[PDB]
Structures are given as structure tokens and as C-alpha cells.
């Protein structure tokens, strides 16, 4: 997504894909709607 | 307030926990959020 809108062959690109400091400076982010961020998933040990 | 302070030329730049909202992003621009919250309610137990 990120070469295609550089590339621009795609003006918008919507895909749930995450903002990086290496993909900010390449293409431009609007305000993000939804939270998210890393996250570790865990098995129900007890 | 602070919004009318930085519109007036006063101030160059907000720091503060100013919520994100559509009719101040009409007049100003906020960068990329710090973190992350919402609105909740404080009571007594």
C-alpha cells in the first residue's frame, strides 16, 4: 500500500495498516479512528 | 480560552490534555495523539 500510494497509482489507501515513523515520512496519515498499537497474545495457563 | 489565545497570536504552540474535536480541528490542527482515552464518569463509592 504504502509503494502504491507512493508510486501514485492509489491517491487513498485504507487497509487498517498501522502509522511508523518510516511511513510517515513517505506518505501522509490523517487523525486515526480506532485504537490499537502492539499487543501480546497469551495461552489460558493457570 | 486557550483556543482563543492561540488564535489571537498570543501563543505559537498548545501543549496541554486538549481533547481532539471536529469544530477546533476546523480552525487549528492537531497533530498525531500521545495517547489514547476516552470519557468515563467519577463517583463516590
Known amino acids: 500500500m504504502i509503494g502504491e500510494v507512493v508510486y501514485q497509482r492509489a491517491v487513498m489507501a485504507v487497509g487498517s495498516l498501522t502509522i511508523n515513523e518510516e511511513r510517515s515520512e513517505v506518505v501522509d496519515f490523517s487523525v486515526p479512528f480506532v485504537e490499537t498499537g502492539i499487543s501480546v497474545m497469551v495461552s489460558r495457563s493457570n | 480560552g486557550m483556543m482563543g489565545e492561540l488564535l489571537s497570536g498570543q501563543a505559537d504552540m498548545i501543549v496541554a ?11 487549528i490542527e492537531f497533530s498525531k495523539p500521545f495517547k489514547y482515552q476516552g470519557l468515563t464518569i467519577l463517583v463516590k463509592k
Open chain 2, 17 to 27: 490534555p486538549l481533547t481532539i474535536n471536529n469544530e477546533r480541528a476546523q480552525y
